[PDB]
Amino acid sequence: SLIVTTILEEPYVLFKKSDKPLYGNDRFEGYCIDLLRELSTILGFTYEIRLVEDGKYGAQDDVNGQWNGMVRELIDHKADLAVAPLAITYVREKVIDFSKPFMTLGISILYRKGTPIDSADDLAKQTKIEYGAVEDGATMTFFKKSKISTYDKMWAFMSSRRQSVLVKSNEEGIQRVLTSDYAFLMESTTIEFVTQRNCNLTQIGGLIDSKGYGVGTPMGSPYRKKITIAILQLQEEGKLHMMKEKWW
Amino acid sequence: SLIVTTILEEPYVLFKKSDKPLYGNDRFEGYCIDLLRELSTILGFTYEIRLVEDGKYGAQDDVNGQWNGMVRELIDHKADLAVAPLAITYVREKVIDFSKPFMTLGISILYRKGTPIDSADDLAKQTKIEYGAVEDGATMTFFKKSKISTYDKMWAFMSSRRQSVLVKSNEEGIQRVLTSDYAFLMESTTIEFVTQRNCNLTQIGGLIDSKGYGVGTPMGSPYRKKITIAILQLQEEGKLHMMKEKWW
Numbered sequence: 001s002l003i004v005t006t007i008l009e010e011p012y013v014l015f016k017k018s019d020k021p022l023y024g025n026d027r028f029e030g031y032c033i034d035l036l037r038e039l040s041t042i043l044g045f046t047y048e049i050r051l052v053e054d055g056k057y058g059a060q061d062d063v064n065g066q067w068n069g070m071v072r073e074l075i076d077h078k079a080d081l082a083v084a085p086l087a088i089t090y091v092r093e094k095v096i097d098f099s100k101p102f103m104t105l106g107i108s109i110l111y112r113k114g115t116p117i118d119s120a121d122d123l124a125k126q127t128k129i130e131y132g133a134v135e136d137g138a139t140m141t142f143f144k145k146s147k148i149s150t151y152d153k154m155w156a157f158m159s160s161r162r163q164s165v166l167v168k169s170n171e172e173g174i175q176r177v178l179t180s181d182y183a184f185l186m187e188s189t190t191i192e193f194v195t196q197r198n199c200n201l202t203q204i205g206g207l208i209d210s211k212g213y214g215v216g217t218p219m220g221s222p223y224r225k226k227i228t229i230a231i232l233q234l235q236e237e238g239k240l241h242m243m244k245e246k247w248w
Numbered sequence: 249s250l251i252v253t254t255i256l257e258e259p260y261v262l263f264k265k266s267d268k269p270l271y272g273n274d275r276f277e278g279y280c281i282d283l284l285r286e287l288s289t290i291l292g293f294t295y296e297i298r299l300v301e302d303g304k305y306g307a308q309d310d311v312n313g314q315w316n317g318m319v320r321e322l323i324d325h326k327a328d329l330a331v332a333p334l335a336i337t338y339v340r341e342k343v344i345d346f347s348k349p350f351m352t353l354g355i356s357i358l359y360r361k362g363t364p365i366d367s368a369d370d371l372a373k374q375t376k377i378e379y380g381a382v383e384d385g386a387t388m389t390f391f392k393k394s395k396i397s398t399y400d401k402m403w404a405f406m407s408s409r410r411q412s413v414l415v416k417s418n419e420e421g422i423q424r425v426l427t428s429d430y431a432f433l434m435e436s437t438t439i440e441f442v443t444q445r446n447c448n449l450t451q452i453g454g455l456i457d458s459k460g461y462g463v464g465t466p467m468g469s470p471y472r473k474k475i476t477i478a479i480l481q482l483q484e485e486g487k488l489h490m491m492k493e494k495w496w
């Protein structure tokens with residue numbers, strides 16, 4: 001029986017709401033839970049869903065070099081699989097493995113409708129409107145690592161206001177956009193979900209980069225190849241697209 | 249020194265234009281040639297480019313299960329890497345390895361402008377207008393394997409006329425569209441290139457599936473991880489996007 005680490009994030013993973021108490025895997029639903037069920041059936045494994053203890057996606061600590069979040073769990077073999085909206089990035093590929101992508105996306109900007117702000121550039125060159133990203137996430141790590149002028153500038157702004165502009169979760173980021181003058185750097189897939197339920201919010205500009213979500217495994221896992229093949233099958237039969245339409 | 253198999257296909261790989269003849273790697277230019285050079289610079293390997301002998305991408309024989317094209321080259325270890333617009337698919341992943349995708353895309357339809365035809369369904373429900381794909385390619389294999397009713401139907405049409413509607417190359421397919429009542433099932437990236445150079449041609453409908461191109465390697469190759477890491481670096485620093493702008 002495989003240990004699967006994941007994280008609460010609508011509409012990928014959320015607590016099923018019901019009248020009666022729910023236990024184990026039954027507590028959860030969402031796109032990634034659907035995915036996990038398909039993978040379990042194809043590859044023929046049983047599993048236990050465990051929410052990542054520290055509630056993080058995964059980043060390397062600057063000072064001690066230690067990883068956190070789901071990535072860390074994989075590193076220490078505390079989980080067999082990470083099934084979640086986990087971005088495939090070059091820093092992560094150095095320490096874990098990923099299946100081929102089950103979804104493609106890009107960093108973009110979440111802000112309110114009807115403002116002059118039309119790009120990351122517009123944001124970088126002012127200080128009135130604050131902006132940030134999820135702490136210890138792939139988006140924050142992009143900006144932290146970027147050599148591109150505009151993004152280095154935005155990272156300088158973010159790190160100096162770290163206290164107020166880097167959030168613990170997408171939901172906190174969205175809440176800031178709703179309740180203050182704040183633009184949120186987040187993934188385009190999640191933005192599409194958010195703007196479908198908040199008719200006063202929109203995506204600003206296009207995609208800042210391009211990346212995929214993949215299932216994470218410890219480096220050298222024998223499951224990576226099997227999961228990659230299952231994902232490509234799900235993709236080709238239209239099942240991933242069907243799952244996205246269901247949850248968005 | 250690495251042997252790298254590839255195939256002619258604009259604008260990914262083409263013979264460079266010149267006054268005096270060229271020799272060796274110098275003969276080649278294109279998107280995938282630039283990609284190969286960047287990989288070479290990052291990983292530090294030397295290489296010799298060889299055009300795939302049979303001029304095929306790679307498909308599997310139904311009866312004996314033997315592969316051809318670039319895929320076979322990799323299986324038989326007659327090449328170290330395949331750098332070309334080689335589609336990541338589940339049947340190929342069973343026999344070779346791919347890096348993470350350096351480009352994402354999807355099957356679509358190339359046809360002429362100003363017609364009533366608006367989707368695959370329109371082609372499927374008639375016979376006057378012929379349609380086909382490159383023989384022994386990922387697109388043809390998609391139709392051959394599909395259980396989606398529309399595509400299954402299109403495959404029954406294609407296979408019964410395989411002699412007349414399946415072509416040896418994208419170039420032959422395009423030529424077919426230009427000289428007869430024929431719609432060509434082909435990859436969206438290439439369609440985008442082609443329609444820029446022929447004003448009477450257009451894409452019909454949206455993307456039929458979603459897939460990526462990957463650098464192919466013989467199964468188990470240590471270069472898979474390194475190239476994946478490198479492709480992600482190139483992607484994140486915006487170099488892959490520049491390369492696409494350059495050739496499209």
Ligand SMILES: N[C@@H](CCC(=O)O)C(=O)O
Nearest residue numbers: 057085086087137138139
């Ligand atoms: N999906 C991201 C977290 C959210 C973000 O960074 O925008 C990750 O894998 O780390």
Ligand SMILES: N[C@@H](CCC(=O)O)C(=O)O
Nearest residue numbers: 305333334335385386387
């Ligand atoms: N890029 C395709 C060939 C062209 C096609 O099938 O449309 C492949 O890897 O097989």
